[PDB]
Amino acid sequence: MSSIGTGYDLSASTFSPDGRVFQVEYAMKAVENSSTAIGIRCKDGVVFGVEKLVLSKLYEEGSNKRLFNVDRHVGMAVAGLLADARSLADIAREEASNFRSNFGYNIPLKHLADRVAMYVHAYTLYSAVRPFGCSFMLGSYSVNDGAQLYMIDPSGVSYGYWGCAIGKARQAAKTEIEKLQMKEMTCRDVVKEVAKIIYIVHDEVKDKAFELELSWVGELTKGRHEIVPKDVREEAEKYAKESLK
Template identity: 35%
Template sequence: MGGNDQQAYDRGTSLFSPDGRIYQVEYAREAVSRGAPSVGVRTADGVVFVAMSRPSSTLMEAESIEKLHKLDDHLGTASAGHVADARQLIDLARRQSQGNRLRYGEPVGVETLTKFVTDHIQENTQRGGTRPYGAALLIGGIDEGEPRLFAADPSGTPNEWKATVIGGGRSDIQGHLESEWTDDLSLTDGIELGIAALAAHENGFEPDDLAVATITEADGYRTVPAEEVAEAFAAAGLVEEEDEGDADDADDAGGNADDDTDTDDTADAGDNADDE
C-alpha cells in the first residue's frame, strides 16, 4: 500500500505529497533545466534577451529555432524547456495583449500580462486531466516608460527581476549576473553582460549560436542583427580566448605535420567528442 500511495503522489498533477510537494511540478522544472538557457537583463534603457539557439545538428536550419518572440510592440519573451509548451503560452500571451488593445485602446501592462499567463499556468497544477507546462518564460517590456522584466516558471509563480536566467546552467549564469549587474547598464552593456553570463556556463559557442533581442521605448521590440551580436561577442572578451585556442590548434597541427603522425589529432578529436 505504501508503494501505491507513493505512486499516487508521483503521478497526480494536483496531489500534495505528505511533505508538501507536487512532484509533477518539480518534474516540469527539471524539463526546463534541461533546455538551452535564455537570459534576461533589465537596463536603464530597456530590456535585453540573450538566448542560446545552437542547432543540435549541422543539418538543422538555425532559423527554425525560436527562442525569442515578439508579443506586442512593447513586449517580448524568451523561453526555455519544451518548445511546444512554450508556444502555447506565447500564443496565449499574444491573444491577451491584442485583446487588451482592442478592448481598452491601450497596450497591456507587463505585470498584468505576466500574471494573466501565470494564472493560466497555475490552473494546470490544480485541475485533473492536465499536466504542468514543461516550459518557463521571461517576459519583458516597457511599462509607462519604465523597463520591467518578469519570469514565469511551471508552478505559475510570477517574479520580477533585474536580471535572471531560465534553462540549463542556472547556477553559474545567475552567479555571474549577480556579480556583474549594475543599475546604470546601457543597452549595449546589457547585451555584453548576457553573452558573458552564458559564457560563464559554456564557453564553446559562436556568435551565430545566439539570438538577441532588445525592447526600448523608442524602438520597441527589435531583433539584434548578427553583425551587432558579433561586435558584442568580441566586446565581451570571448573572441580573444577563441583566437588563442585556434593558435594552439594551429601549432599542434604544425607539429603533427612535421612528425607525419595523426596521433595527436585523434586524441584531440576524442576530447572534443567528450566535450560535446
C-alpha cells in the first residue's frame, strides 16, 4: 500500500515513510469526484471553460460557483469539492485585497501563485484545520507580465502552464490541449477552442450531464473577469458540439 485510509491521517500532524502524507493524496481524489475545469492561456488573456454538473433546471447564475472573481484582472476556474471551493476563493482573494491596498497596483501572477501556494500548503501542516481538497487555476491578464496561467493543486504545488486542466479527466485533457494551438492567438478565437476540448475529453465514466460555462479575462472585457455573453457562449458551444461529432 502506498496509502492507508486509517493510520497516518488520524491527525494532520503526520508524515508517512515515502515522504508524503496520505491526506494530501486523498485530497487529489476529492478533485476526481467532480468534473473538469480547463483553462487555456493566450498572450491577450486567459480563457476558462468549465463543465458544470447539473441536477436541476431551476438553477440560475451564481450556482455551483465554478467561476470566482478574485480581482479585477484575476479570474479563477475551479474543479473538485464545491465546499472546499469557497475557502480557496477566500485565501487567494484576501491576499489580493491586502496587496491592492498597500502596493497600489495590478498583481503579477508570478508572485501570487507562490504566495498563495504557501498558504495552501500551510493548512496541510496544521492540524488546526484539514488540508484543502479542491484544485483551482489562476488566470490573469495584466501589463505586469502579460497573460499568465498557473495551476495550484491541493498539495500546495504551483506550476506554469499555457494549458492546464484539473478534474478526473486531467491527464486525458492535457494531452488533448497540447495537440491544439491557442498559445499566441486571441481570446476571441480561443473561447471556441476551450469548449471543444471539454466535449471531446467528456467521458461517461469520468463525468455526468453538464451545462457549459465559459469565462473571459483578457483585453476584450478590458482586464476584468466576466462570464462570456449567452450569444457568444452558444457560438463557442456550437463549434464544441460540431467538433465531437
